[PDB]
Amino acid sequence: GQDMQSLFTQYFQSMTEYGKDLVEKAKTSEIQSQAKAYFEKTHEQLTPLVRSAGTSLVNFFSSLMNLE
Amino acid sequence: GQDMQSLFTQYFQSMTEYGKDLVEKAKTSEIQSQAKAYFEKTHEQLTPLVRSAGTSLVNFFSSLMNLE
Amino acid sequence: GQDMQSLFTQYFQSMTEYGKDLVEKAKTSEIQSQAKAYFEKTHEQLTPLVRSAGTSLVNFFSSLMNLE
Amino acid sequence: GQDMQSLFTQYFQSMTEYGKDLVEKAKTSEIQSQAKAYFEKTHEQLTPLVRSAGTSLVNFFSSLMNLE
Amino acid sequence: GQDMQSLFTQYFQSMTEYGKDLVEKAKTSEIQSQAKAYFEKTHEQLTPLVRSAGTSLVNFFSSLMNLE
Amino acid sequence: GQDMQSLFTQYFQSMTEYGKDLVEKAKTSEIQSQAKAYFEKTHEQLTPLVRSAGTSLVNFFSSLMNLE
Amino acid sequence: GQDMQSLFTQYFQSMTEYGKDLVEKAKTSEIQSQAKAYFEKTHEQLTPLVRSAGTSLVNFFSSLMNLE
Amino acid sequence: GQDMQSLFTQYFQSMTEYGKDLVEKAKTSEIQSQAKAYFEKTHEQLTPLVRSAGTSLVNFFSSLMNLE
Amino acid sequence: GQDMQSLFTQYFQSMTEYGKDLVEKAKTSEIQSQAKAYFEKTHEQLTPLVRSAGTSLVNFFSSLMNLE
Amino acid sequence: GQDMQSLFTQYFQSMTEYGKDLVEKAKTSEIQSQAKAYFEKTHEQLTPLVRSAGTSLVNFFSSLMNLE
Amino acid sequence: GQDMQSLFTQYFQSMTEYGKDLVEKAKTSEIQSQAKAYFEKTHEQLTPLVRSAGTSLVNFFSSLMNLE
Amino acid sequence: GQDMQSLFTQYFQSMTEYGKDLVEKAKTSEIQSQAKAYFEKTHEQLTPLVRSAGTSLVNFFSSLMNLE
Amino acid sequence: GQDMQSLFTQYFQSMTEYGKDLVEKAKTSEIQSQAKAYFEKTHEQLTPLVRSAGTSLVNFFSSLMNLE
Amino acid sequence: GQDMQSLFTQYFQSMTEYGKDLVEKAKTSEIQSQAKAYFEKTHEQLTPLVRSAGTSLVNFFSSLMNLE
Amino acid sequence: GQDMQSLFTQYFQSMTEYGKDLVEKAKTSEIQSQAKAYFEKTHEQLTPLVRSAGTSLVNFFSSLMNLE
Amino acid sequence: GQDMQSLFTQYFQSMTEYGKDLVEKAKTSEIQSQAKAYFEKTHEQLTPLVRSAGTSLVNFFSSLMNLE
Amino acid sequence: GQDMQSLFTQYFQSMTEYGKDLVEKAKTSEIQSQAKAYFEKTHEQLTPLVRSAGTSLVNFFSSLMNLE
Amino acid sequence: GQDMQSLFTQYFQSMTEYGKDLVEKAKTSEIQSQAKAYFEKTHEQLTPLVRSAGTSLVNFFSSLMNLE
Amino acid sequence: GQDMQSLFTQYFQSMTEYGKDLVEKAKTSEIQSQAKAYFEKTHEQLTPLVRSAGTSLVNFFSSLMNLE
Amino acid sequence: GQDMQSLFTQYFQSMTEYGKDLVEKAKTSEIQSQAKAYFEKTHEQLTPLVRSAGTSLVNFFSSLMNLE
Amino acid sequence: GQDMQSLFTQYFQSMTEYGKDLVEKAKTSEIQSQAKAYFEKTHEQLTPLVRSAGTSLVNFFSSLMNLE
Amino acid sequence: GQDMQSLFTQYFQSMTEYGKDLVEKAKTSEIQSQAKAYFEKTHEQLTPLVRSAGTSLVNFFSSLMNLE
Amino acid sequence: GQDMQSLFTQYFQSMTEYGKDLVEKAKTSEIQSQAKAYFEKTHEQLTPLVRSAGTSLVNFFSSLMNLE
Amino acid sequence: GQDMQSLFTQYFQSMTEYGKDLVEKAKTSEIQSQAKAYFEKTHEQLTPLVRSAGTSLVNFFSSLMNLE
């Protein structure tokens, strides 16, 4: 059949600001940090950590992710 | 059949600000941080952590995520 | 059949601000932080943590998420 | 058959502010934080934590989430 | 048959503010925080925690969430 | 048959403020916080915690949520 | 100001037949004819002769039709 | 100001037949004819003769039709 | 200002037949003819003779039609 | 300012037949003829004779049609 | 300013037949003829005779059609 | 300023037949003929006679058509 | 003079258990906690909080505690 | 004069257990905690918090605690 | 004069356990913690926090604690 | 004069366990922690935090603690 | 005069365990930690933090601690 | 005069264990740490942090600590 | 077992004169004389002749005084 | 077992005169004389002749005084 | 076992005169004389003749005084 | 086992005169003389003649005094 | 085992006169003489004649005094 | 084992006069003479004649005094 599973984004005579992480002043601070830190014996199969207009597209067709 | 499972976003003579994480002043603070910290023997299969206009599209067709 | 399970967003001569996490002053504070901290032997299969105009689209077609 | 299970949002000559988490002053405070903290032997299958104009669309077609 | 289970939102010459979590002053306070804290041996299958104009759409078609 | 189980919201030459959690002054206080705290051996199957113009739409068609 | 002088026609799960001139049998007949025939020294300035779901929109903004 | 003088026609899961001039049998007949015939010294300035789902839009912005 | 004087026509999962002049049998007949015939010294400035789903858009911006 | 005077036509999972002049049988007949015939000393300045899904767009920006 | 005076036509998973003049049988007949015939001393300045999905776009920017 | 006066036509997973003049049988007939015949002392300045999916674009930028 | 303001405790061939805070089982409980929590503009001059065989001896001789 | 303001504790052939804070099992609990938490503009001059066989002896001789 | 303001503790053929904070099992708990947390503009002059057989002896002789 | 403000502790053929902070099992817990955390503009002049058989002896003779 | 402000500790044929901080098992825990964390504009003049058999003796004779 | 402000500790045929910080197992933990962390514009004049049988003796004779 | 056969004499802020043989005037006299004089073949085994605050302690543990 | 057969004499802020043989005047006198004089064939085994605060302690542990 | 057969004498801020044989005037007198004079064939085994604060300690451990 | 058969004498801030034989005037007198005079065939085994603060300690460990 | 058979004498800030034989005036007198005079065939084995703060310690370890 | 049979004498900030035989005036007198005079066939084995702060220590380890 006909399948459209996509990100469709069209702009016409437009103005768009987006996905901006803006620090003006920082001191002894941890600001906007994407992190994973301290894992032990963990089993993660589809965990996309995403931020600030970044993109993660996964198209599995008849595929097999096996973590045995 | 006909399948449309997509993100459709069209702009016409428009103005749009979105997904902005903006710090002006920070001191001894932890501000807007996406994090996962301390996991032990965890089993996570589809956990998208997402923020600030970022995108995560997963299209599994006849696929198999096996965590055995 | 015909299936439309999508995010349809159209703009016409419009102005839109949205999904903005804005800090002006921070001191010894933890402000707007998306986090997961301390898990032990946890089983999570579809838990999208989402914030600030970010997007997470999952389209499973005839697929199988198996956590055995 | 014909199935429309979507997010339809159209704008015509309009002005819209929404999903804004705005801090002006913070001191020794924890403000607007999406978090999951301390889980032990937990079984969560569809728990979307969502905030500030973020979106989480799940379209399972003839699919199977098995946590055995 | 014809099925329309959607979020339909149209704007015509309108002005709309909504889903805004706005702090002006905070001190030694915990303000607007979406959180899950301390779970032990919990079984949660469809618990969407949602806030501030965020959206969570789940469309299961002939699908099976099995937590055995 | 014809089924319309949707959220239909149309605006025509209108002005609407809604779903706003607004703090002006806070001190040693816990204000507007959506939380779940301390669960032990709990079984929750459809418990949407929702607040401030956020939305949670669940469309199960011929589906099966099994917590055995 | 805000001015909406338009033809707004929306259809939702509907069936509509309209503006249909259907002849099955005709003999030596004049059937459903829009015509103007024999004018002499006539002065017509806005005369829309319309039929069968046809449309005629006149939008004059600060304009001048002068027949001197 | 904001001006919407337009033809807005949206279709959702609908079926519509319109503006159809269908002849099945004709003999020595004049059927569904749009015509203007025999004019002498006529002065016509905005006369839309429209039929069968046809459209005629006149948008005059600060303009001048002068027939002197 | 913002001006929308347009023909807006959107189709979603729809079926539409329109503007159709269909002859099945004709003999010694004049069927569905758009015509202007015999004019003498005529002055016509904006006369759209339109039919069968045809379209005529006049957008005059600060213009001058002078027939002197 | 922002000006949208256009023909906007979008199709989504739709089926549309329109503007079709179909003759099956003709004998000694004049069927669906667009014509202008016999003019004498005529002055026509904007007369669109349109038919069968054809289109005619006039966009005059600060222009001058002078018939002196 | 921003000016959009255009013919915008987008197709998505659609099927469209239009502007079709189809003769099956003709004898001693004049079928679907666009014609202008016998003019004498005529003054025509913008007269688009259009048919069958054909297109005619006039975009005059600060121009001058002078018939003196 | 920004000016978009164009013919925008995009196709996505679509099927479209249009502008087709198809004769199957003709005898002693004049079928689908675009013609201009017998003009005497005529003054025509912008007269597009268009048919069958053909296109005619006039883009006059600060130009002058002078018929003196 | 002779002043004896003391804690005199003598043991002879004795057995004494005292001041024991003993928890065997605790769950989601706050057990035996000495605390002061949330004071604002408070003036406390001699407030000994004491527990579990702890001791607080204050001997002021000709001294002056001034809280001005 | 003779002043004895002391803690006199003598043991002779004795057995004494005292001041013991003993936890055997704790879960999601706050057990035996000496704490002061959240003070604002407080004035405390002699407030000994004491617990579990701890000792606090204050001997001020002709001294002056001045909090001006 | 003769002044004895002391801690006198003598042991003769004795056995003494005291001031013991003993945890056997802890999970997601805060057990026996001496703490001061969040003070703002506080004035504390003699506040000994003491626990578990610890000792705090203050001997001010003709001294002056001035907090001006 | 004769002044004895001391800690006198003598042992004769004795056995003494005291001031022991003993953890056997800890998980995601904060156990026995002496801490001061988050102070702002605080004025503390004699605040000994003491624990687990530790000692703090202050002997001020004719001295002056001035916090001006 | 004669002044004895001392720590006198004598042992005769004795056995003494004291001031022991003993961890057997720790995981994702903060156990027995002496700390001061986050101070801002604080004024502390005699604050001995003491633990686990440690000692802090201060003997000021005719001295002057001036914090001006 | 005669002044004895000292730490007098004598042992006779005795056995003494004390001031021992003993970790057997640690994982992702912070155990027994003496620390000072994040100070800003702080004024500390006599703050001995002491632990595990360590000693801090201060003997100021006719001295002057001036922090001006 | 525990055996206390001792002379226990403690003094607290007391004044005691005792065991005093004071002669002021003596002439040809025998005053306060402890004596044994003229024994012949005598057998004395435990005969304490004691006077004036003198002390005689006999502690025989499993011993044997044999006068054979 | 525990055995305490001792002379325990403690003094605290006390004044004690004892065991004093004071002669002021003596003439031809025998004053306060301890003596044994004229023994013949005597058998004395434990005869303490004690006076004036003198002391005689006999501690025989498993011993044997044999006068055979 | 534990055995304490000793002379324990402790002094604290005390004044003690004892065991003093003071003669002021003597003439032809025998004053305060300890003597044994004229023994014949005597058998004395433990005879302590003690006076004036003098001391005699006999500690026989598993010993044998044999006068055979 | 533990054995303490000793002379324990401790002085703290005390004044003690003892064991003093003071003659002021003597004439033809025998004053304070310790003597043994005229023995014949005597058998003395442990006879301590002690005076004036003098000391005699006999510690026989598994020893044998044999007078055969 | 542990054996303490000793003369323990400690002085702290004390004043002590003792064991003093002081003659001021003597004439034809025998004053404070320790003597043994006229023995015949005597058998003395442990006879300490001690005076005036003198000391005599006999420590016999597994020894043998044999007078055969 | 551990054996302490010693003369332990420690002085701390003390003043001590002792063991002093002081004659001021003597005439035809015998004052403070230690003597043994006229022995015949005597058997003395351990006879310490000690005076005036003199010392005599006998430490016999596994030794043998044989007077055969």
Side-chain angles (χ1 to χ4, degrees), chain H residues 28-47:
Chain H
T28 59
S29 52
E30 177 180 2
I31 318 187
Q32 302 148 356
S33 184
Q34 69 182 34
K36 288 277 252 184
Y38 299 87
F39 285 176
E40 201 225 36
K41 297 154 164 102
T42 67
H43 297 262
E44 290 182 340
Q45 258 190 324
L46 182 42
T47 74

Coordinates of all heavy atoms in Angstrom, one line a residue, chain H residues 28-47:
Chain H
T28 N -33.4 18.7 -31.6 CA -34.0 20.1 -32.0 C -34.1 20.9 -30.8 O -35.0 21.8 -30.8 CB -35.2 19.9 -32.9 OG1 -36.3 19.2 -32.2 CG2 -35.0 19.1 -34.1
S29 N -33.3 20.9 -29.7 CA -33.5 21.6 -28.4 C -32.2 22.4 -28.2 O -31.2 22.2 -28.8 CB -33.7 20.6 -27.3 OG -32.8 19.6 -27.2
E30 N -32.3 23.5 -27.3 CA -31.1 24.3 -26.9 C -31.0 24.1 -25.4 O -31.7 24.8 -24.7 CB -31.3 25.8 -27.2 CG -30.2 26.7 -26.8 CD -30.4 28.2 -27.1 OE1 -31.4 28.6 -27.7 OE2 -29.5 29.0 -26.7
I31 N -30.1 23.2 -24.9 CA -30.1 22.8 -23.4 C -28.9 23.3 -22.6 O -27.9 22.8 -22.8 CB -30.2 21.2 -23.4 CG1 -31.2 20.6 -24.4 CG2 -30.5 20.8 -21.9 CD1 -31.4 19.1 -24.2
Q32 N -29.2 24.1 -21.6 CA -28.2 24.5 -20.6 C -27.1 25.4 -21.3 O -25.9 25.2 -21.1 CB -27.5 23.4 -19.9 CG -28.5 22.5 -19.1 CD -28.1 21.0 -19.1 OE1 -27.1 20.6 -19.7 NE2 -28.9 20.2 -18.4
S33 N -27.6 26.4 -22.2 CA -26.6 27.3 -22.8 C -26.5 28.6 -22.2 O -27.5 29.4 -22.2 CB -27.0 27.4 -24.3 OG -26.0 28.2 -25.0
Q34 N -25.3 29.0 -21.7 CA -24.9 30.3 -21.1 C -24.6 31.2 -22.4 O -23.8 30.7 -23.2 CB -23.9 30.3 -20.0 CG -22.4 30.0 -20.4 CD -21.6 30.0 -19.2 OE1 -22.0 29.7 -18.1 NE2 -20.3 30.4 -19.3
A35 N -25.3 32.3 -22.6 CA -25.2 33.1 -23.9 C -25.4 34.6 -23.6 O -26.0 34.9 -22.5 CB -26.1 32.5 -24.9
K36 N -25.1 35.5 -24.5 CA -25.3 37.0 -24.3 C -26.0 37.6 -25.6 O -26.5 38.7 -25.4 CB -23.9 37.6 -24.1 CG -23.4 37.4 -22.7 CD -23.9 38.3 -21.6 CE -23.0 39.4 -21.1 NZ -23.6 40.2 -20.0
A37 N -26.0 36.9 -26.7 CA -26.8 37.3 -27.9 C -26.6 38.8 -28.4 O -25.4 39.1 -28.6 CB -28.3 37.0 -27.6
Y38 N -27.6 39.6 -28.5 CA -27.5 40.8 -29.4 C -27.5 42.2 -28.7 O -28.6 42.7 -28.6 CB -28.8 40.7 -30.3 CG -28.9 39.5 -31.2 CD1 -29.5 38.4 -30.8 CD2 -28.4 39.5 -32.5 CE1 -29.7 37.2 -31.6 CE2 -28.6 38.4 -33.4 CZ -29.2 37.3 -32.9 OH -29.3 36.2 -33.7
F39 N -26.3 42.7 -28.3 CA -26.3 44.0 -27.5 C -26.0 45.1 -28.5 O -25.2 45.0 -29.5 CB -25.2 43.9 -26.5 CG -25.5 43.0 -25.3 CD1 -24.6 42.8 -24.3 CD2 -26.8 42.4 -25.1 CE1 -24.8 42.0 -23.2 CE2 -27.0 41.6 -24.0 CZ -26.1 41.4 -23.0
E40 N -26.6 46.3 -28.2 CA -26.3 47.5 -29.0 C -26.1 48.7 -28.1 O -27.0 49.0 -27.3 CB -27.5 47.8 -30.0 CG -27.0 48.6 -31.2 CD -28.0 49.7 -31.5 OE1 -28.6 50.3 -30.6 OE2 -28.2 50.0 -32.7
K41 N -24.9 49.3 -28.2 CA -24.6 50.5 -27.3 C -24.8 50.2 -25.9 O -25.2 51.1 -25.1 CB -25.4 51.7 -27.8 CG -25.1 52.2 -29.2 CD -26.3 52.9 -29.8 CE -25.9 53.7 -31.1 NZ -26.3 53.0 -32.3
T42 N -24.4 49.0 -25.4 CA -24.6 48.7 -24.0 C -23.4 49.0 -23.1 O -22.3 49.1 -23.7 CB -25.0 47.2 -23.8 OG1 -23.9 46.4 -24.2 CG2 -26.2 46.8 -24.6
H43 N -23.6 49.4 -21.8 CA -22.5 49.7 -20.9 C -22.6 48.8 -19.7 O -23.5 49.0 -18.8 CB -22.6 51.2 -20.5 CG -22.5 52.1 -21.6 ND1 -21.3 52.8 -21.9 CD2 -23.3 52.6 -22.6 CE1 -21.4 53.6 -22.9 NE2 -22.7 53.5 -23.4
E44 N -21.8 47.7 -19.6 CA -21.9 46.7 -18.5 C -20.6 46.8 -17.8 O -19.5 46.8 -18.5 CB -22.1 45.3 -19.1 CG -23.5 45.1 -19.7 CD -23.7 43.7 -20.2 OE1 -22.7 43.0 -20.5 OE2 -24.9 43.4 -20.4
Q45 N -20.6 46.9 -16.5 CA -19.2 47.1 -15.8 C -18.9 45.9 -15.0 O -17.7 45.5 -15.0 CB -19.2 48.5 -15.1 CG -18.4 49.5 -15.9 CD -18.1 50.8 -15.1 OE1 -18.9 51.2 -14.3 NE2 -16.9 51.3 -15.3
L46 N -19.8 45.4 -14.2 CA -19.4 44.1 -13.4 C -20.5 43.1 -13.5 O -21.3 43.1 -12.6 CB -19.0 44.5 -12.0 CG -18.5 43.3 -11.1 CD1 -17.6 42.3 -11.9 CD2 -17.8 43.8 -9.8
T47 N -20.6 42.3 -14.6 CA -21.7 41.4 -14.8 C -21.2 40.0 -15.0 O -21.1 39.5 -16.1 CB -22.6 41.9 -16.0 OG1 -21.9 41.6 -17.2 CG2 -22.9 43.4 -15.9

